[PDB]
């Protein structure tokens with residue numbers, strides 16, 4: 001399966017996916033990395049790995065649908081089968097999500113359905129949980145509400161900050177996102193017709 005990875009930043013999840021998809025038994029190959037932001041570290045990581053990159057600046061588009069169309073054009077250019085959102089911080093439009101239904105994965109740094117949205121660690125710390133984690137899910141129109149593929153729990157330590165908690169949770173992200181991508185790319189896991197996850 002042919003994979004696009006979309007990023008907005010550092011790209012540690014991208015690097016874990018690069019490492020995993022290059023193992024001999026990988027069912028996935030990363031053929032394009034797309035960032036909505038120029039000069040982010042994730043682009044350096046892709047270049048170093050010899051993977052093509054494109055920058056599609058959302059600021060240059062009239063609306064969300066036009067931006068998504070620009071992304072979709074590149075996905076078609078590279079005959080992409082599966083899209084991974086790896087620190088990509090834009091909400092995708094309904095039609096784009098429907099087109100890629102069952103083919104687009106996101107990583108989120110909480111145990112969904114807790115702490116949906118952009119500041120999950122801040123929320124976890126404010127709430128006072130002692131266990132948080134991360135989730136890989138299929139992308140549905142409603143943000144952070146699509147079908148869950150894998151999750152991993154991560155403890156919150158007393159005195160944690162966003163800095164220390166995000167660091168700990170990223171170790172788990174780098175485990176489950178490669179594992180989830182392999183499950184989908186190999187056809188082991190798919191989005192069922194009834195909308196529920198299906199393990200074959």
Ligand SMILES: Nc1nc2[nH]c(CCCCCCC(=O)N[C@@H](CCC(=O)O)C(=O)O)cc2c(=O)[nH]1
Nearest residue numbers: 088089090091092106118139140141142143144
């Ligand atoms: N339909 C849909 N789009 C999705 N994008 C992401 C991936 C993570 C999305 C980050 C939140 C963006 C946000 O909160 N606000 C702005 C973006 C501001 C920014 O540039 O960071 C927005 O409206 O896009 C996940 C996901 C999803 O499950 N469903």
Ligand SMILES: NCC(=O)N[C@@H]1O[C@H](COP(=O)([O-])[O-])[C@@H](O)[C@H]1O
Nearest residue numbers: 009010011012013086087107108109
């Ligand atoms: N709403 C989505 C979200 O918060 N995503 C989070 O952004 C970080 C990106 O790090 P990276 O650029 O090092 O992969 C990751 O922690 C990811 O789970």
